[PDB]
């Protein structure tokens, strides 16, 4: 069995780090004036359903700070009205456009701010996408680390310039939604452990988080799963050794809802804030809260650690926002209802006022949502069918093309299929302000165009369909979908995770039938991820296939732009379209197989998605980074310019000893509930109810000093040595990792008749017997006019060419023959040269 090695003590903030020096100072000037009670309020959630947002902290009224509001989603504001619904992160990734990564972020952030949210619970790098059938991979960006890391840095930078606090979501493992928690139909004693060896962790799953740390993300969420059999929220090597030690993360770490299962041990493991605060939803008891105060008071949790917890939360707050002000606008919505009036303490039915204000907060974001959705559509196949000109008879076919007869928001958290699919289910959702359905957008295009339009919005009226598409001169566009979501909603026996990689609602045989009766058949797929196209992609009557992903509120208008050439395709697949499911290598584990704790050995190593296909030459139908245009592009004249140099010297030194900020009284009666006080039911408070700390806690396991149940040095205050693989005041790793060793340029020439975008992609091969054949390392999206030639330049950093040595515990550049390639895809590599 795998074990998680201990890394202690929990690193405290560096006052000279990166872009936090000022935010550190302002936090220092603020937490210094906090009582122990107030520190426990900022770190402990009020309990599930306790307030307005999906998570809220204790307030600090004496210092003028209201409760902090934390809320979903990574694609728009969840559970409220007059928000926008942006396209998924997966689809956004498919644009391969950093500008759009950022614009979507700043967009989402501005809406969260307008509602009064202080922490937006996004963007997502866990799951990265280890298995195509994973329930939530669509919330992320790509199974590929470089594209995902770029998308994260850019989305985080957007969210926070708005500016609310961004949250790098689900720290590592959690590539699957089965067994993420316990119970729920299965007999497992603990959550699944995904076990990841050290090299895999550094150059695959942690890679994007590094990028989020280096971009300045204010918070990080730990995940429900264990890693080497200790929950990510109790994990020393992960939270202390990797995130806060090596990458030097300066912000605060919050828990996934009910992901914390221990109090003090979790605090020194690295957890700064527990959410929504209970031990368990509606239980009224906390592993922190009252337990947190008696932990300091009885000596076993060092004072410096709770000050660090406070320092991190308040530093994040001050890093965004950018003024020393606290003092926020009111939280103007409520998550638990849409009613205008209701209990502000929803769970307890206490505090009946106006909790919903219906603030339009939408701006003109529909322009951006429609642009991203179109520029993120992938044109998979095009045998002379597209763009559509003025078809005499256009016939749209499929349920996915129509309205949910029950309305766009009929199902809470999007937990059902019906009509068009524009969004997966789970927390990663928002309500649509409207949902432009393809039927309506295409019909209106055809009418303006003078065409004849008929639609059959069913997957099963077969003879009805036949009569429609058999007629002379028919252009048939057929809409099919596949879905997944978070594990707490089962839609048609899919327990969050996809059961299989085929289309839902019999889309396969719907396509096979339409292609059977019509010679110009176009397939559009709305889906959470790849679907096996094997039985029908090469049909001679299917003349084009497009993947439009999860486009959000403007899905209809976006696919019309692409079909009629208003927007020229360019979108590249953020994943591989394989022929079998075994061809992807790793797979979801749907059954614990009598095991008490399901174990997931990540023995595929760094070989997920296209890396796996390329290594074992399993069959690929559309490769990673594939996408077509209505024009053509000629790559010529490769140039690699090598910068000298600067030797990679280690890092190096010794930190400052753990500080204290403010003081705490030792008169236990100071922490009793104030005399008049009224306890909202099940609300999580910081006050003790007995001057007997053992009784105050009510923990039946009470009474051991830190040396009896915490590992060595777990509370140590002494200066700690600096890790070889970090930078001194440089969060993200040894800053020489990001020196540019090579500049790579080619000449990209549009050779078609229509203007368009091109997604030049940069791949490297690091020699190496255990290495992939190609790894993506840079990319660029260029706009080129028909006659034009354009200079693409890419960069390769010292990290870009490195392997993680575990003996050395750093990054090295081994002495293997190494090469760089430029391609139109993972496989369509047209230029290559030796890196000298
Ligand atoms: C000071 O106050 C704090 C706050 O309440 C109080 O903390 C609690 O401490 C106990 C230790 O006494 C913690 O409980 C243990 O937790 C660890 C990690 O989860 C377990 O390994 C421990 O196992 C013991 O007993 C088991 C049963 O035989 C064995 O299997 C095991 O090997 C161990 O012997 C035990 O479960 C508890 O988590 C915290 N509570 C919170 C909310 O943090 C502390 O005890 C007080 N200190 C003093 C000196 O009074
Ligand atoms: C999950 O477990 C794996 C393996 O138990 C952890 O990976 C291992 O990480 C340690 C460092 O944390 C590596 O240690 C080094 O060992 C070399 C000898 O090979 C030694 O010379 C060095 O001094 C160094 O200590 C270890 O090699 C590595 N093992 C593998 C197979 O990669 C992993 O970090 C664990 N993850 C978590 C979150 O606990
Ligand atoms: C820790 O956080 C909690 C929750 O945010 C804080 O509790 C809030 O405290 C105020 C007063 O301290 C309570 O106000 C009272 O309402 C009555 C009428 O019901 C009114 O007469 C009072 O003047 C006051 O407005 C408020 O209800 C309470 N919130 C809850 C949910 O109970 C607490 O103060 C924080 N502790 C510290 C040390 O900052
Ligand atoms: C802190 O703890 C004390 C006791 O540990 C709490 O006080 C007590 O509350 C219980 C009920 O919650 C009272 O007991 C029983 O209550 C019913 C309903 O009133 C009563 O009719 C029965 O005859 C029976 O006594 C108990 O009398 C009461 N004792 C005292 C001294 O208050 C206290 O409420 C807790 N404080 C907070 C802020 O939660
Ligand atoms: C502090 O944490 C402990 C557990 O770490 C909480 O303990 C519960 O106490 C009840 C009392 O009957 C037991 O039945 C449970 O087994 C205990 N553990 C749980 C619920 O996980 C304790 O309530 C916490 N203190 C406060 C004030 O919430
Ligand atoms: C491609 O589409 C055409 C229809 O446009 C299919 O052809 C018809 O085929 C049936 C039986 O094969 C004949 O009875 C009809 O007279 C044909 N009509 C026309 C207009 O050709 C053709 O079979 C389709 N191809 C495939 C592989 O299914
Ligand atoms: C099957 C068939 O012949 N369809 C014809 C097509 O050839 C022609 O281009 C179009 C407009 O003239 O009218 C229709
Ligand atoms: C052949 C087969 O198993 N098809 C089903 C499909 O009907 C269903 O919609 C989907 C849900 O994930 O699971 C699969
Ligand atoms: C488990 C662990 O790291 N313990 C450390 C030890 O290595 C170090 O020598 C000591 C200072 O003398 O501080 C403590
Ligand atoms: C301790 O606190 C209580 C209430 O907060 C107060 O009434 C009492 O006088 C204090 N005692 C000492 C010795 O400070
Ligand atoms: O294909 C048979 C059935 O598969 C499953 C569901 O998605 C249904 O909509 C469908 O009828
Ligand atoms: O580079 C030296 C270091 O090698 C590796 C680390 O895990 C340490 O055990 C050691 O100090
Ligand atoms: O609902 C709010 C939170 O709790 C859970 O539902 C999800 O796992 C989280 O990702 C989410 O941020
Ligand atoms: O802290 C609570 C935690 O510790 C104990 C174990 O038996 C676990 O099952 C439980 O979740």
UniProtKB/TrEMBL annotation:
Glycosylation: residue positions: 667
Stored Pfam families: Fn3-like, Glyco_hydro_3, Glyco_hydro_3_C
KW Transmembrane (keyword) present: no
Intrachain disulfide bonds: 53-69, 222-233, 411-416
GO biological process: glucan catabolic process
Protein origin, superkingdom: Eukaryota
An example Gene Ontology molecular-function term: beta-glucosidase activity
Pathway where it operates: Glycan metabolism; cellulose degradation
Keywords: Carbohydrate metabolism, Glycoprotein, Glycosidase, Hydrolase, Polysaccharide degradation, Signal
Annotated spans, Disordered: 706-734
EC number: 3.2.1.21
Family recorded in the similarity comment: Belongs to the glycosyl hydrolase 3 family.
Protein name as annotated: Beta-glucosidase cel3A
């Amino acid at each position: 069995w795998a074990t998680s090695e201990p890394s202690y003590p929990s690193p405290w903030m560096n006052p000279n780090a990166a872009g936090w020096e000022q935010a550190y100072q302002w936090a220092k000037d603020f937490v210094s004036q906090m009582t122990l009670l107030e520190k426990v309020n900022l770190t402990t959630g009020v309990g599930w359903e306790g307030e307005q947002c999906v998570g809220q902290t204790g307030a600090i009224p004496r210092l003028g700070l209201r409760s902090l509001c934390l809320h979903d989603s990574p694609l728009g504001i969840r559970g409220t009205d007059y928000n926008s619904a942006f396209p998924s992160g997966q689809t956004t990734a498919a644009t391969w456009d950093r500008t759009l990564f950022y614009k979507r972020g700043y967009a989402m952030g501005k809406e969260a701010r307008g509602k009064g949210i202080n922490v937006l619970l996004g963007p997502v790098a866990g799951p990265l996408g280890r298995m195509p059938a994973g329930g939530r991979n669509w919330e992320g960006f790509s199974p590929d680390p470089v594209l995902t890391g770029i998308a994260m840095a850019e989305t985080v930078k957007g969210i926070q310039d708005a500016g609310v606090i961004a949250c790098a979501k689900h720290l590592i493992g959690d590539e699957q939604e089965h067994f993420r928690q316990v119970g729920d139909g299965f007999d497992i004693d603990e959550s699944l452990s995904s076990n990841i060896d050290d090299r895999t962790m550094h150059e695959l799953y942690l890679w994007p988080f590094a990028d989020a740390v280096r971009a300045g993300v204010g918070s990080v969420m730990c995940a429900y799963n264990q890693v080497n059999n200790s929950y990510s929220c109790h994990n020393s090597k992960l939270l202390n050794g990797l995130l806060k030690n090596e990458l030097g993360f300066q912000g605060f770490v919050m828990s996934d809802w009910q992901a914390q299962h221990t109090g003090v041990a979790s605090a020194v493991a690295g957890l700064d804030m527990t959410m929504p605060g209970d031990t368990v939803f509606n239980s009224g008891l906390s592993f922190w809260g009252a337990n947190l105060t008696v932990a300091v008071l009885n000596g076993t949790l060092p004072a410096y650690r709770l000050d660090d917890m406070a320092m991190r939360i308040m530093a994040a707050f001050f890093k965004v926002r950018g003024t020393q002000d606290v003092d926020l606008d009111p939280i103007n919505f409520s998550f638990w209802t849409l009613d205008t009036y209701g209990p502000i303490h929803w769970g307890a039915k206490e505090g009946h006022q106006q909790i919903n204000f219906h603030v339009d907060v939408r701006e003109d974001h529909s322009r951006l949502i429609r642009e991203i959705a179109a520029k993120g559509t992938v044109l998979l196949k095009n045998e002379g069918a597209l763009p559509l000109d003025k078809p005499k008879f256009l016939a749209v076919i499929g349920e996915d093309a129509g309205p949910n007869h029950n309305g766009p928001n009929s199902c809470d958290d999007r937990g059902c299929v019906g009509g068009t699919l524009a969004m997966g289910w789970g927390s990663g959702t928002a309500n649509f302000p409207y949902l432009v359905t393809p039927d309506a957008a295409l019909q209106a295009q055809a009418i303006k165009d003078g065409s004849r339009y008929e639609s059959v919005l069913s997957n099963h009226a077969m003879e009805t369909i036949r009569k429609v598409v058999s007629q002379d001169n028919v252009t048939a566009v057929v809409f099919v979908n596949a879905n997944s979501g978070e594990g707490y909603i089962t839609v048609d026996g899919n327990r969050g995770d996809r059961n299989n990689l085929t289309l839902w609602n019999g889309g396969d045989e719907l396509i096979k039938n339409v292609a059977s009766w019509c010679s110009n058949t176009i397939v559009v797929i709305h889906s959470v991820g790849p679907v096996l196209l094997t039985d029908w992609y090469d049909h001679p009557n299917i003349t084009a296939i497009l993947w439009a992903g999860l486009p959000g509120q403007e899905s209809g208008n976006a696919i019309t732009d692409v079909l009629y050439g208003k927007v020229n395709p360019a979108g590249r697949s953020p994943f591989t379209w394989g022929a079998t499911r075994e061809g992807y290598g790793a797979d979801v584990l749907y059954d614990p197989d009598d095991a008490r704790v399901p174990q997931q050995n990540f023995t595929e190593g760094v070989f997920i998605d296209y890396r796996y296909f390329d290594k074992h030459n399993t069959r690929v139908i559309y490769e990673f980074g594939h996408g077509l245009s209505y024009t053509t592009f000629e790559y010529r004249n490769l140039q690699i310019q090598k910068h000298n140099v600067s030797a990679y010297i280690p890092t190096t030194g010794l930190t400052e000893p753990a500080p204290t900020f403010g003081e705490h009284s030792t008169n236990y009666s100071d922490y009793l509930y104030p005399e008049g006080f009224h306890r909202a039911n099940r609300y999580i408070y910081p006050y003790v109810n007995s001057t007997d700390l053992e009784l105050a806690s009510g923990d039946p396991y009470y009474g051991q000093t830190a040396d009896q149940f915490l590992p060595p040095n777990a509370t140590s205050s002494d200066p700690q040595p600096l890790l070889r693989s970090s930078g001194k005041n440089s969060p993200g790793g040894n800053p020489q990792l990001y020196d540019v060793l090579y500049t790579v340029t080619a000449d990209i020439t549009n050779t078609g008749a229509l203007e368009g975008d091109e997604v030049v992609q940069l791949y490297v091969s690091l020699g190496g017997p255990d290495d992939p054949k190609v790894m993506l390392r840079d990319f660029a999206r260029l706009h080129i006019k028909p006659g034009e030639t354009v200079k693409f330049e890419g960069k390769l950093t010292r990290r870009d060419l490195s392997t993680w040595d575990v003996t050395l515990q750093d990054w090295v550049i081994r002495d293997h023959t190494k090469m760089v390639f430029l391609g139109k895809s993972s496989r369509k590599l047209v230029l290559g040269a030796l890196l000298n």
